[model samples]
Target chain A: SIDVKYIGVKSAYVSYDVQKRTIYLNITNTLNITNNNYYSVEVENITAQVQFSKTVIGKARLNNITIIGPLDMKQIDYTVPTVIAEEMSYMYDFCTLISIKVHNIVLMMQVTVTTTYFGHSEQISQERYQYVDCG
Target chain B: SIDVKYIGVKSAYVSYDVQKRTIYLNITNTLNITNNNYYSVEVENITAQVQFSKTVIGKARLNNITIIGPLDMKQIDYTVPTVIAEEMSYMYDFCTLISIKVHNIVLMMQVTVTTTYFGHSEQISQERYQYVDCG
Candidate 1:
């Protein structure tokens, strides 16, 4: 079995445009592989979904394979979608009351990787959240 | 609601390396849409798995999004993996008995597409097979 010394959220962002009435978010994660087979692992089929209050707003996916060597650190990125709704939150200048009105963001990611041992495979998945602070 | 007049396998290929005992297969599909919502549909998170005698030999996946317009015909392609196993079959020449050893190839595909209405979604899936003949 592979050991995960540490896995954490590196950064998160939420941007809203009052003019366009659109909201977007992105999440970056850092994964440190502590131990594994001598060679690298093939990571593919990466996908993610962003939601607000359980309603999906955005979705993201990767187009190519990611190879992670043993004991290597990798960064994963995802663009969150705005929840589809009748009423949307918009933001204006300094006070940005609209952005302040909306707060929580939830994200989920899934990935499948080929095992170091020829032909074997496994899947890694996770779901996390971030709360935008109005203060 | 969306309607599919037809969905079927367009073509299948089984490649054999006489000198090297390597087998690879690819499957192509054609879909005819009879009706759908306005604009286009987002086809992403597409995946397929290949099986040999109840054992999963290979898997296929889509890395990016596919957009399908109303009443349009779309082609889907998948590269199936070679069965990873010992006592593997090896072939020497055509009239190649090696390729003959393998017969039927089974594949199941799954994809998620969004509904015409924003933020709403639906999943489309299918499973099919092909036979490779030595003759």
Candidate 2:
């Protein structure tokens, strides 16, 4: 009794700090969830992995579980590489001069939840990102 | 330094439940943020407004302020229609038989936040959704 959705990229920006030897991708996206069950849903232990052009780059995990009411909406805002100066780097650059096509980036996510009738339901999904302002 | 961009739709789907008189849109998207400031950044009071073919359908607010490390990325998932069933009726349909042209469905969002160097920064964005598996 749950709904899953991917809120396509609302915004995508690529930044290359030549001095830092790292590339930074700032993306804005939304995830939609609808619960048709009778009870509320608690989504926790959320873990996410990010890849640049198919290469692992960064990741993060939510510190607490998000509780969503039945038939509700939850707006989530997150930054990749929890520690910017430390992780997001040149390895993730635009490489625009070499290619003018969509540079594939992937995001893998896993979450453990307790639904109306279940005790530890895990939802894992993989998504790709490209076709942004990489220029 | 700041980078701004619009992330296009990666995936879209629509479902109609006659009994509920509602149309549901499931989307997958991404937002990239690359902050070069000396200190980490925090985004708060993020709000979003959902629309279907020029009609306002729903809105959402984030429950907490997200602090992003310098030079990072964030993955966000979202669900709208907080009652499109009454508004997204046949009016917002693909008009299946009519235009084989670009359909019109838009999602608009506005966000305000405080960064390490800037106090109360605001970002406004809007996205369009169409050409999904609506059949």
Candidate 3:
């Protein structure tokens, strides 16, 4: 069995381009994985999506294969690139000012990991609520 | 058995007094308790401490007894009053400006609960990391 744990958001930065009327976001997230089985496990892929309320804002993926030995633990650090469109002006302003200055913004991280152990494949899914500084 | 889950910080506000050279903080935290016994459980007391890194900032307690029916769940909302002295000038400044305006501040919440079920008393302790807006 494989256990996945969301450590925390390491960093979050945001920038806006006036000409394009777009907002760009960068975030780093850390996760811990524990292999509790008797044999080694190969992580085929890892994917994550960042959402604000009901709207999806960003996404990330780890396509490289990773291996974990039995009873071993490993930490993964991944960065995501997010773009906010001009249509969501309210969200953009909120991210640039209110969220960074006056309030903590909570984002939902939906993660999925595929692992193969002894030719048997399984997928692990979890939702993590993370607070990020929009600035 | 009893399970305690920290939902999140509902609100956090900070104010400073120039004359007194002190910073005051108000925070509300929500926690959920689940009673998994066949009989009713009585919560004797609930206590929590909030710390920024290694420094303790605030404390809260719920002294009133609360009862939960068999396999029932209950949510508790408690507010804590926190004051930062003049000695912690750097912390006070950080709370007012840097933490609120540019970064997310992570606070460690240490919680303890005493519950009695069938005349047997037990203590449950957990540490939760919460993010709050310093403003």
Candidate 4:
């Protein structure tokens, strides 16, 4: 058996282009996995999606496969990038206003992890909320 | 008369040196000032202090003085650097563990702004809380 936890965000960068009316957001997130089985577990895949104010902003899949030893813990870090174009004017206004007036914004992330152990495959899903500074 | 507001953090960077048992934190903060007076206001000095878990970690004074036009809003950005050394073992441990186990850390900041209008000097003080990622 294995346990997966969304520890938190490691770093975040947000920028806006006035001419394009676009917002660029990059976030680095950390995940911790604990293997409780007596045998090692192989992490086959990890997929993550992020949303702001119920709007999908970013998606990513882990590129490197990893293995965790029995009863051991491992941490994984991944970066996700989001681009809000001028077409998404509502979101653009929301983000810009928050950056100038509010400062802090919350993002929701859904992560899915697939693992294989003893020739058996399993999946785990977790939802996490991250606080970020829009300024 | 003028109004000063701590808008929020613009960006934050945190790194740890395991061998040296040291932590480095850099934060960029934003301040918004609205000049309501009929004449221009000259900003003479700006001083800021940051604390983590009730312990002072950083202090800085603005080097460049600025002037705000009448009925205008101006934004100022400043970066403060904090170093936690080996001697501060308690803070070191707390910061390290939080990076590994937890992800978000809160910092308290106190800002003082001195301004001159028509040869009269005044000061404004504001305390604000900033959220940062330790991971």
Candidate 5:
């Protein structure tokens, strides 16, 4: 076991913009490993989530989970509407996260996603922008 | 109509650590701005807030206000005590903000800041990891 030290990131990016209900991601790879590295996601709440597995260890994966994006008109009826946040996963350095579709699940009504990531620093979070009404 | 399209930032970093309750900030220079371009601070609920005055336009400024950081044993008394959240200011990249010493100020007690910027990109939000005692 020679001194083979690699860097890792504890936090990553997550985002969602209001217009397209569009989703974006900017994952970064700090560890220079490849193969056998597994990363998966489990969406506890919401109508949908993106799916991805396997990472080349230092490569960022760009996933598009518009499943929760377009055609979401069931939210406009709310006085203080909000979206249920959706969740996703990424494997870089450590088991990092890149949330999208991540919204605030208001009981059985709404959840607001917290992200709009792309380009460098894809692991940081975006300011809360859109809100979906589940009421 | 001046073509001083100096950029501005609406959001910036805010951090809090378990020990010390110490806070920090990272300000950047983008808009060739300066003078009253000078920023002022108003600490309403809390006992203190980091304050700064004047800027050289295209330069970043560093500030520190440990007034509210230490000497707060008031937060460890409740089941899930939380900070009351305080506010502050900075001038750079347009409306850009470099939050520090930003904290939650409990109505009658407790407070905590959210920042640790010093190097660069001191103009983004950090993960919320603090709570103060109000009960």
Candidate 6:
């Protein structure tokens, strides 16, 4: 059994001896593993928050949601709702359009967001509401 | 003593005789209260998930964030990173794009989701990762 482990990342480069020939490689941000295929990329909080625009929905809560980007000036269409309030925090990317949907007892929340930068968050600038009751 | 209660709703029409002119209007889903303006429209799950597109960022996590509608085809632009992960449920409207972002101790996350639907929850559809060295 090949023992795979999370080796401490180092800024060094070398070669892997394959049978007889050695192949040189530049290690950018490579994963450390053994000869076995037991290694995997594990992402935590798979069940985290979902923010589309200004809204957020999920088990965990969220806050401080924003949308960042330049609007396409061809057509001015504003239909999606944005702005959310939830528990916890996380990382972010820049320039993206987003939204959400969910259901549950007591209450449910969904969000809509967008990113139009490289590494920045811009909340959708629109709050349009309409109410109705099934009750 | 004012009788403030959550009365079982089942209605059609009625009126509050103010001036001599009895204002007979359409009866919507109005809360039955005797002289009480304490009622309000509420929004729940203040803390949930966040979604934009290609990515999501938050604590609760995300599942699905879709942008349902026709695209503004005047511009062929894909700059925002949308989609995310979280939990729970909520309401939604038509034509929405989504994203998410979050952060926590040891497990801080910040997702950026656009209404661009991936239909995936646990992991992001576009897992565009760029890791670096603090060393």
Pick by DockQ: which candidate is best?
Answer: 6
Top-scoring candidate (lDDT): 6
Residues A39-131, candidate 4, lDDT per residue (tens digit)? 222323324222212222233333343432222223333232233323212211222211122323222211112211112322222333344
B28-132, model 1: which lDDT tens digit per residue?
Answer: 323322332232233334253322122222334547444432222234232322232223343222321112112122221111222111222222222232322
User: How does model 2 score on DockQ?
Assistant: 0.03
In candidate 5, what are the lDDT values of residues A1-135, reduced to their tens digit? 111111122221112112323232332323222223222222122233332222232233333423232113332221222232223422122221222223222121112222222112111222222221221
User: Once model 6 is optimally superposed onto the true structure by TM-score, how far is the C-alpha of residue A133 displaced, in angstroms?
Assistant: 66
The sequence of per-residue lDDT tens digits that candidate 1 reaches over residues A1-135 is 132111231211122112222232232323322322242223334243322222222343346644432222234232222232223333222312112123222222211221111122222222232222222
True contacts reproduced, candidate 5: 0.00
Q: Identify the superior model by DockQ, candidate 1 or candidate 3.
A: 3
Residue runs of model 6 more than 4 Å from their true location after superposition: A1-35, A45-135, B1-135
Cα lDDT of model 6 by residue, A21-51, tens digit: 3332432323332232222222133445554
Instruction: Please identify which of the two predictions, 4 or 6, would achieve the higher TM-score against the true structure.
Output: 6
Top candidate when judged by TM-score against the true structure: 1
For model 3 the TM-score comes to 0.13
Q: lDDT (0-100) at residue A97 of candidate 4? A: 14
Enumerate the candidates' DockQ scores in order: 0.01, 0.03, 0.02, 0.01, 0.01, 0.04
- Range of the 10 consecutive residues with the lowest summed lDDT in candidate 1 chain A: A109-118
TM-score of chain B of each: 0.15, 0.15, 0.14, 0.15, 0.12, 0.16
CA-lDDT, candidates in order = 0.26, 0.28, 0.28, 0.28, 0.24, 0.30
lDDT of 3 by residue, B1-135 (tens): 322233232211122112223332342323333323242333233243222112222333323333322212234222222333332122112332223234333322211122211123223223443454333
TM-score of 1: 0.14
Candidates 3 and 6 compared: the better one by DockQ is 6
Model 4, docking class: incorrect
